[PDB]
Design a protein around this ligand. Structure first.
Ligand SMILES: OC[C@H]1O[C@@H](OC[C@H]2O[C@@H](O)[C@H](O)[C@@H](O)[C@@H]2O)[C@H](O)[C@@H](O)[C@@H]1O
Ligand SMILES: OC[C@H]1O[C@@H](OC[C@H]2O[C@@H](O)[C@H](O)[C@@H](O)[C@@H]2O)[C@H](O)[C@@H](O)[C@@H]1O
Ligand SMILES: O=S([O-])[O-]
Ligand SMILES: [Cl-]
Ligand SMILES: [Cl-]
Ligand SMILES: [Cl-]
Lengths: 420, 415
């Protein structure tokens, strides 16, 4: 009689359950085990997983957003996995920013295994930058280059072959709960932070001089006319669609866009579109105090009430290990969490994927705080209010500061009060 | 027989029956009978404060969000940080909802969010089109909002059923709930009702910013955008005016969408032109932000309950995704649990998706032990301002004199 494992996942791929079943079929056959998968929508998964955690009833393994690992770990419900991580190559096998997501900030033991990475780089229309007299090497080297290329792109008379209309220099989604991830590399590039440690404790640094320098740099590009009004009312998926449809010279996204450029519109790609035929990518530019690439993605964790910790740890080793890492990265359009998988020919043979790997070298993530959730909700609320000012062309440095002082007061309250 | 006692307010069309249907799977899972008592809002206030003073009551009681401070300060509520952690803690709630879980500045949570009231603008897509008003522009900013109202007053459009023109905006000022209508204009202007600054709580109703927002809103009626009859009417009469084709624009909660889908015989308005030409938009950005008024109700557990562990299990069930979606449908409210909005029920209606967009700007009153006295004073003096508005008599100086007066009484109350 087959042994049993349960895994909870979020919709990471086109057929989430079927794809995950294909991924683990070799493990099932090797260990005489059936892996039962349950797919949770990203919006409900957190509450289902905290109910599972507190009730002691749920799967053996659960997917976690990297930003979730601290909160769940602090609940005391996760089995240590330093053994699994040592088996996969240890701390050297991971980008530093990925290794940071294996534990609660400052915790003694690892409680999550890196599964896949989300990271962001600039896609750009090679035809638009040429028509504008912009060298992508200079546009994506520095903030000065970045703004100077957007200026030339706003001036350009170039029209998309299919829309027969000019392109927005830059598109960025003004309407999303994931707005912080888009701001983070500007905050970081200026020497800033969203939170930082002081007086025995974590606090907001959103109102620091450097954070405010980076936020204003980024948000002010929109008030300078480089971002259309229309973008700031749109979500991440709408902005991707705008870039495929020739509306945007430049936008930030993950590696998944490359695969979409290879497949026809009917298959949910955009290979027929001008943008697919004129596609470049660049890492985020260096800011005044450094160059940072936002990283997110998902990790896997083992509940301490699992009835088969050794077999589940074999599944964590399989899913975290070289073959599964390359296959699931293909299925999801993500970057492997395991550094060694970046050397796979399926990344090295595509120059656009090679660029994502160059951008990966600058990877940076949020501190893995037990209270990150509340921090991010408060930051997102106030960032939303800053974009409103940008839409009316009313974002001053002073008005930005007043918004971030307000966010900082609420974040510091949240951090002080984080339960248990 | 395991039993729990729960006190609720009339939140749904058959309050008791609907609540019994909601908990029936909990009752069956745990062999518990949940005994529900429905109390009208005023009656509930007296009985809950008596239960708090006497140590005799139900296990669980519904509280208005704005009641949590007052009842918590009486020291009678069991902490529920554990229940809230099970439901996903601070992450699983909008920040304005999370604030209603405790007395302002308290460490420990004492109430569990049950459902959220929030306010957005409903509009006649046909009326706006006939007036040459773009709803995304009209509802982006105060400037767009006033400009759209002016065009709507000028329009020759007539409701197809009434064969008569539409009032540009309908709102009450004949209601004890007048502060909730005013709150987003106060907040949009950079104002507040009360502010903690300088080490204590104080009225900010006479702040330049609060006065700029109050006057912006109240003056729209004197400019001819709100008809005379609207100011003699309560919240339900304004709903009826909009369903009957009399109003281009009015503020309500998500229940109107449900009602637009249901025939008049089932207490909806699906047959009426307004149901067939229905749009929703968030409140507009003011000079210092965009804010959506949040209220609603929470559940609390009395610390004298003999059934605290079982009651906490019922708190987890009622606060959790399945019961959160079902009770939002029964009441026509938004779930308090942000996770529950990911239910197909919400994601699969464009009008409800717009409420969830407006939800991102959620704001609530501070969870003050003395809130009710603060709100009574604010509502008395706002009521006086609306009386002047009905007579076309409001000035910035008259408004200021009224809010100076409310602020003196509020600061005494807060001391
Ligand atoms: O915020 C939690 C978690 O979010 C992760 O991304 C979530 C996001 O994933 C997209 O690819 C998907 O299309 C969206 O529907 C979904 O919301 C993120 O990578 C993690 O770092 C983060 O912890
Ligand atoms: O002030 C207490 C409490 O009031 C709640 O509003 C009550 C209100 O709800 C309507 O849906 C109902 O039709 C009215 O008759 C009833 O008065 C409010 O949502 C809470 O935030 C507040 O604390
Ligand atoms: O109408 S009865 O269900 O309270
Ligand atoms: Cl962006
Ligand atoms: Cl940070
Ligand atoms: Cl306030």
């Amino acid at each position: 009689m087959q042994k049993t494992l349960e895994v909870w996942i979020m919709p990471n791929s086109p057929q989430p359950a079927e794809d995950f079943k294909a991924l683990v079929a070799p493990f099932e056959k090797a260990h005489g085990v059936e892996v039962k998968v349950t797919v949770l929508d990203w919006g409900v998964a957190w509450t289902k997983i905290t109910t599972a955690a507190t009730s002691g009833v749920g799967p053996d393994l659960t997917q976690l957003g990297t930003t979730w690992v601290g909160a769940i770990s602090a609940m005391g419900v996760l089995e240590p996995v330093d053994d699994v991580l040592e088996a996969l190559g240890g701390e050297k096998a991971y980008l530093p920013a990925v290794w940071r997501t294996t534990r609660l900030e400052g915790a003694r033991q690892a409680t999550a295994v890196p599964w896949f990475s989300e990271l962001r780089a600039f896609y750009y229309r090679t035809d638009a930058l040429k028509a504008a007299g912009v060298n992508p090497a200079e546009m994506f080297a520095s903030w000065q280059g970045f703004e100077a290329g957007l200026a030339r792109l706003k001036a350009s008379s170039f029209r998309d072959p299919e829309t027969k209309a000019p392109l927005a220099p830059l598109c960025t989604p003004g309407r999303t709960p994931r707005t912080l991830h888009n701001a983070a590399p500007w905050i970081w590039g200026a020497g800033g932070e969203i939170v930082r440690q002081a007086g025995g404790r974590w606090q907001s640094a959103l109102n620091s001089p450097e954070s405010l320098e980076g936020l204003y740099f980024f948000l002010s590009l929109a008030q300078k006319g480089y971002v259309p009004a229309e973008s700031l009312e749109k979500n991440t998926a709408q902005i991707e669609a705008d870039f495929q449809a020739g509306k945007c010279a430049v936008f930030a996204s993950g590696p998944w866009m490359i695969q979409r450029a290879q497949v026809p519109e009917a298959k949910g790609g955009f290979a027929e579109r001008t943008a697919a035929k004129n596609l470049g990518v660049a890492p985020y530019p260096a800011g005044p105090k450094g160059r940072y690439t936002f990283f997110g993605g998902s990790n896997l964790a083992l509940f301490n009430f699992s009835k088969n910790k050794p077999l589940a740890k074999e599944l964590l080793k399989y899913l975290g290990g070289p073959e599964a890492q390359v296959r699931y990265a293909q299925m999801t359009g993500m970057l492997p969490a395991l550094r060694s998988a970046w050397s796979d020919p399926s990344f090295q043979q595509n120059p656009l994927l090679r660029t994502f790997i160059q951008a990966a070298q600058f990877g940076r993530t949020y501190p893995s705080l037990a209270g990150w959730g509340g921090v991010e909700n408060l930051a997102v609320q106030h960032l939303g209010m800053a974009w409103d000012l940008v839409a009316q062309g009313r974002l001053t440095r002073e008005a930005l500061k007043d918004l971030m002082d307000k966010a900082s007061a609420a974040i510091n309250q949240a951090l002080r009060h984080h339960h248990h």
